[PDB]
């Protein structure tokens, strides 16, 4: 969302304050959760700025 | 005349229905998408003065 702060927003993906689009979501637990072995999904955790 | 100016300056320390009357206080405590509303309130009041 515009102007939202957090680990993902401040390290992975930042939306501008002038966004003119749409956001769509749907759970993917049925398949993308894998079999106790979902490890290809990663995310940054530390950054200077 | 000497009264009028003293009425104008003292209008700077009024809220006009906002959290505070300091610009550098609303910015340092809320994210901007929550802050433009307060800033607009102050701007409209100070224009009317």
UniProtKB/Swiss-Prot annotation, chain B:
Q: Report which residue ranges the record marks as coiled coil.
A: 1-39
Q: What does this protein do?
A: Subunit of the fusion protein that is processed upon entry into the host cell. Mediates fusion of the virion and cellular membranes by functioning as a class I viral fusion protein. Contains a viral fusion peptide that is unmasked after S2 cleavage. This cleavage can occur at the cell membrane by host TMPRSS2 or during endocytosis by host CSTL. In either case, this triggers an extensive and irreversible conformational change that leads to fusion of the viral envelope with the cellular cytoplasmic membrane, releasing viral genomic RNA into the host cell cytoplasm.
Q: What name is this protein filed under? A: Spike protein S2'
UniProt organism field: Severe acute respiratory syndrome coronavirus 2 (2019-nCoV)
């Amino acid at each position: 969302a515009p102007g939202q702060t957090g680990n993902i927003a401040d390290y992975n993906y930042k939306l501008p304050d002038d966004f003119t689009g749409c956001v769509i979501a749907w759970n993917s637990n049925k398949l993308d959760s894998k079999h106790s072995g979902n490890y290809d999904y990663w995310y940054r955790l530390f950054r200077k700025s | 005349n000497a009264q009028a100016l003293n009425t104008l300056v003292k209008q700077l320390s009024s809220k006009f229905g906002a959290i505070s009357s300091v610009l550098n206080d609303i910015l340092s405590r809320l994210d901007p998408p929550e802050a433009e509303v307060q800033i607009d309130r102050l701007i409209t009041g100070r224009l009317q003065s």
